[PDB]
Design a protein around this motif. Structure first.
Motif, PDB file in Angstrom:
ATOM      1  N   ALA A 225     -11.488  -5.425  -2.060  1.00 29.25           N
ATOM      2  CA  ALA A 225     -12.791  -5.987  -1.722  1.00 29.25           C
ATOM      3  C   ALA A 225     -13.317  -6.874  -2.841  1.00 29.25           C
ATOM      4  CB  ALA A 225     -13.781  -4.866  -1.417  1.00 29.25           C
TER       5      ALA A 225
ATOM      6  N   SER B 163      -8.829  -0.041  -1.947  1.00 31.03           N
ATOM      7  CA  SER B 163      -9.801  -0.778  -1.151  1.00 31.03           C
ATOM      8  C   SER B 163     -10.860  -1.429  -2.028  1.00 31.03           C
ATOM      9  CB  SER B 163     -10.447   0.152  -0.127  1.00 31.03           C
ATOM     10  OG  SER B 163      -9.465   0.904   0.559  1.00 31.03           O
ATOM     11  N   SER B 164     -11.299  -0.738  -3.081  1.00 36.40           N
ATOM     12  CA  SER B 164     -12.310  -1.310  -3.967  1.00 36.40           C
ATOM     13  C   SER B 164     -11.806  -2.589  -4.627  1.00 36.40           C
ATOM     14  CB  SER B 164     -12.718  -0.284  -5.021  1.00 36.40           C
ATOM     15  OG  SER B 164     -13.257  -0.923  -6.163  1.00 36.40           O
TER      16      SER B 164
ATOM     17  N   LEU C 178      -7.481   1.122   7.273  1.00 35.24           N
ATOM     18  CA  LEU C 178      -7.622   0.248   6.115  1.00 35.24           C
ATOM     19  C   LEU C 178      -8.709  -0.789   6.347  1.00 35.24           C
ATOM     20  CD1 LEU C 178      -5.727   0.998   3.867  1.00 35.24           C
ATOM     21  CD2 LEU C 178      -4.487  -1.122   4.230  1.00 35.24           C
ATOM     22  N   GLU C 179      -8.758  -1.354   7.554  1.00 36.40           N
ATOM     23  CA  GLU C 179      -9.779  -2.350   7.856  1.00 36.40           C
ATOM     24  C   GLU C 179     -11.173  -1.750   7.754  1.00 36.40           C
ATOM     25  OE1 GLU C 179      -9.033  -4.215  11.595  1.00 36.40           O
ATOM     26  OE2 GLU C 179      -7.587  -5.647  10.780  1.00 36.40           O
TER      27      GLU C 179
ATOM     28  N   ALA D 148       0.820  -1.203   0.000  1.00 37.00           N
ATOM     29  CA  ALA D 148       0.000   0.000   0.000  1.00 37.00           C
ATOM     30  C   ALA D 148       0.858   1.259   0.000  1.00 37.00           C
ATOM     31  CB  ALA D 148      -0.953   0.002   1.192  1.00 37.00           C
TER      32      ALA D 148
ATOM     33  N   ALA E  19     -12.093   0.900   5.942  1.00 36.29           N
ATOM     34  CA  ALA E  19     -12.389   1.223   4.552  1.00 36.29           C
ATOM     35  C   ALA E  19     -12.779  -0.020   3.767  1.00 36.29           C
ATOM     36  CB  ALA E  19     -11.190   1.911   3.905  1.00 36.29           C
ATOM     37  N   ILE E  20     -12.062  -1.125   3.970  1.00 40.75           N
ATOM     38  CA  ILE E  20     -12.393  -2.348   3.247  1.00 40.75           C
ATOM     39  C   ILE E  20     -13.705  -2.937   3.753  1.00 40.75           C
ATOM     40  CG2 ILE E  20     -11.602  -4.647   2.655  1.00 40.75           C
ATOM     41  CD1 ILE E  20      -8.840  -3.742   2.584  1.00 40.75           C
TER      42      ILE E  20
ATOM     43  N   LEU F 274      -6.450   5.492  -0.944  1.00 36.72           N
ATOM     44  CA  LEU F 274      -7.268   4.654  -0.079  1.00 36.72           C
ATOM     45  C   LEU F 274      -8.336   3.883  -0.844  1.00 36.72           C
ATOM     46  CD1 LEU F 274      -7.585   3.794   2.730  1.00 36.72           C
ATOM     47  CD2 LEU F 274      -8.919   5.812   3.257  1.00 36.72           C
ATOM     48  N   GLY F 275      -9.292   4.601  -1.433  1.00 38.71           N
ATOM     49  CA  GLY F 275     -10.416   3.936  -2.073  1.00 38.71           C
ATOM     50  C   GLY F 275     -10.025   3.154  -3.311  1.00 38.71           C
TER      51      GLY F 275
END
Lengths: 58, 175, 142, 207
Positions: free
Chosen positions: C31, C27-28, C99-100, C18, C102-103, C23-24
């Motif tokens: 996921a 994360s997307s 991070l947790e 990372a 956001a995911i 971030l997003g």
RNA sequence: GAUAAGUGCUGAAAGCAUCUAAGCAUGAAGCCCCCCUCAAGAUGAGAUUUCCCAUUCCGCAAGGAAGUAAGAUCCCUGAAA
RNA sequence: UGGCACCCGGCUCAUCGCAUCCUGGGGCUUAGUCGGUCCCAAGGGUUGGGCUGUUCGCCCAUUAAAGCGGUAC
RNA sequence: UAUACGUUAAGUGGAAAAGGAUGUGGAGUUGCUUAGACAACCAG
């Protein structure tokens, strides 16, 4: 069926929309999404279909 | 002519080295400073002159560039000579100050204040009504002068207070 | 009559750094990998995802002024209890928890979502203990 | 820091040197023995363990005897941990005695208070009584139980329940006298807990 | 330890200036720590020290059953509860 | 057989907003003693009586202060 | 997480504005205007 076909096509470099446009244009090869799910069972033939669609798409 | 877009001459008696992230280490006789800039900032520095231009006409380089190139020559001066600064703390009973080293001040206000000076500066001033200080960097010397300026405070009614080099004290409607 | 999947699957192990990524936009993708949409044997009612290990989670990046404006809230169910944290503190004190969160916000709710979330491992720094599982490096395609 | 464990005996008075009278709590504490030293690289925090009172063989199982085997001593009744102390002035078998405290030194006392059982709102929380003998039928009841809009009851509303019997601490007490031949400490003031219970004496935290 | 209103030093668009745009300091009974208490049903169910051990039957292996070890409980005298 | 606007107080328990009464930090306008004004700030605190329907209310004596409001009075 | 051309830097985007506002990108003009500005810096 659409989700599975999308994943299988993205395993080849294409996307779902581009693959479908190529199939609709490279002749037609009428193939319901249900019968194009054969990516799960025999992946080799699906790659042949994707190759044909790519060949016509460019 | 933008403030900073010039050709700054230097005595060519100093040392300069360059690295990535605009890490420009400027040393010489005494000083050694390093100010890192954002990478888009072009660097054009000769042995003494620095004819740096602006990469773009937008504010990241139409305005910020003039900030950088100018201060570059500053290190050379800070490397070579030093800096000086002045102050005054004029008052009726404003002789309270440090007898060397750490500062000790009784304001007449019944609470004293104690401060210890930091590295890099020298203070040579017997009579503390006027203040003269010297050092190596203009930034640190300005902060130091700011420290001693904050030591004392002015009052509006009486013509006595703390002022910068050659400055007057505030006067207001006190009656 | 298509084919579903039932316990006859294998889960691979992937490691994503990372460093630099926003971030997003990371994360997307993570996921999506976790839910298992990247394989042709997808199945809505069965876990078919993989295991995702994140390293260097403290070097994440945010655009704009969000780094000083994005605020994380929580409520303790007591009257007047509303705790807040700025993104800077979250980044410099609990890097893995941001991070947790956001995911986790990007995963389906219910039993399967919470069981899916158990496959994510986040580590601050550039070292992980998962050696016997033989992780395979995986870059962000998107 | 520094600390010790002891048993409460009761209260009395002591005449000071200038002729005034002060209350005194008597703490009786036989010498304690260390049992274990917890280090950072093996447990994650520096600490020491202390045992207080001997008990006969019948009231002891094999695990406790095995635990106390390392430092030769009889099985102990009370065992407590002290953290924040200097970790280089203690051994596994060392003995801690009451002489470590000197007269006139500030200390802290931690202990478990008494118990009062099921108690009402007035005694537990110091609330007020309704008026009596003016046509009123409201005595000793807890009070109104919130507003109407939330359609529920907020957390934290105080209601009758079991009272007392919890750990508490009293700070900034001072020592009046210490003697080692009887292992007695004389604290000035009160100390939580019933008689014959356990109380911990620690050095000052506020200092 | 950072922060609000404010006080500054550097320096910009814009040769001058300029606490303000890139920067760097100081600054509140608020904000996080420090003080006190609960807390691994934290299903993410953590850690260290010590004790007990590889029993018997069928089932050749797995397995399942019975009696036990360390240790608890039932029962009895009570109260710092 | 005109003219032209509008459509319950007391007790027991509390909790929240800031549009801040006191306490904290500031500019100021104000010799200091002070006082007035304007910003930042919700952590805590914010009184006992006599006449009285407490009113379109009087008084007494204290305190650093005796804030304004929402929650089906 | 398509292909091209521009705008916005504040989370505007994500309610409806009087009033106020060097925020201000373009298309204009109108000035004086390299024997010569805005800082010019020396000099009644």
């Amino acid at each position: 069926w659409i989700t599975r076909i999308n994943a299988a096509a993205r395993m080849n470099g294409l996307s779902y929309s581009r693959l479908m446009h190529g199939l609709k244009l490279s002749g037609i090869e009428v193939n319901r999404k249900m019968l194009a799910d054969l990516a799960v069972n025999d992946l080799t033939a699906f790659n042949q279909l994707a190759d044909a669609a790519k060949a016509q798409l460019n | 002519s933008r403030v900073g877009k010039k050709l700054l001459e230097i005595p060519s008696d100093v040392t300069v080295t360059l690295n990535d992230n605009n890490t420009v280490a400027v040393k010489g006789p005494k000083g050694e400073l390093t100010r890192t800039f954002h990478p888009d900032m072009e660097i054009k520095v000769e042995d003494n002159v620095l004819t740096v231009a602006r990469p773009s006409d937008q504010k990241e380089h139409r305005a910020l560039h003039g900030t950088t190139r100018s201060l570059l020559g500053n290190m050379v001066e800070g490397v070579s000579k030093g800096f000086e600064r002045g102050l005054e703390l004029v008052g009726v009973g404003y002789r309270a100050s440090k007898s060397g080293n750490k500062l000790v001040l009784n304001v007449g206000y019944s609470h004293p204040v104690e401060i210890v000076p930091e590295e890099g500066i020298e203070i040579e001033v017997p009579s503390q009504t006027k203040v003269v200080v010297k050092g190596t960097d203009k930034e640190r010397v300005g902060a130091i002068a700011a420290n001693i300026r904050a030591v004392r405070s002015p009052e509006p009614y009486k013509g006595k207070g703390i002022r910068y080099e050659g400055e007057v004290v505030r006067r207001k409607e006190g009656k | 009559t298509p084919m579903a999947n039932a316990s006859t699957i294998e889960r691979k192990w992937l490691v994503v750094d990372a460093a630099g990524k926003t971030l997003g936009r990371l994360s997307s993708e993570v996921a999506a990998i976790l839910r298992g949409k990247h394989k042709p044997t997808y199945t809505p009612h069965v876990d078919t995802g993989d295991h995702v290990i994140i390293i260097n989670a403290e070097k994440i990046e945010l655009t704009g002024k969000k780094l000083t404006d994005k605020i994380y809230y929580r409520h303790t169910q007591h009257p007047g209890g509303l705790k807040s944290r700025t993104a800077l503190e979250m980044r410099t004190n609990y890097p893995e928890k941001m991070l947790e969160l956001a995911i986790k916000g990007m995963l389906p709710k219910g039993s399967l979502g919470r069981q899916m979330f158990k496959k994510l491992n986040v580590y601050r720094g550039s070292e992980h203990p998962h050696e016997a599982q033989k992780p395979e490096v995986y870059e962000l395609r998107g | 820091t520094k600390g010790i464990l002891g048993r409460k005996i009761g209260m009395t008075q002591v005449f000071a040197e200038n002729g005034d009278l002060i209350p005194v709590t008597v703490i009786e504490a036989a010498p304690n023995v260390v049992l274990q030293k917890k280090t950072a690289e093996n447990d994650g925090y520096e600490a020491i363990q202390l045992g207080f009172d001997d008990k006969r063989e019948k009231l002891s199982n094999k695990p406790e005897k095995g635990h106390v085997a390392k430092a030769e001593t009889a099985p102990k009744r009370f065992v407590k941990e002290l953290r924040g102390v200097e970790m280089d002035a203690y051994e596994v078998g060392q003995e801690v005695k009451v002489e470590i405290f000197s007269a006139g030194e500030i200390v802290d006392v931690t202990g478990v208070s008494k118990g009062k059982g099921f108690q009402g709102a007035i005694k537990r929380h110091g609330q007020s009584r309704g008026p009596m003998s003016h046509g009123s039928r409201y005595h000793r009841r807890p009070g109104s139980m919130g507003p109407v809009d939330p359609n529920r009851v907020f957390k934290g509303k105080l209601l009758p329940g079991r009272m007392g019997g919890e750990q508490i601490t009293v700070q900034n007490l001072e020592i009046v006298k210490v003697d080692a031949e009887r292992n007695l400490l004389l604290i000035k003031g009160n100390v939580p807990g019933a008689k014959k219970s356990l109380i911990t004496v620690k050095s000052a935290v506020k200092s």
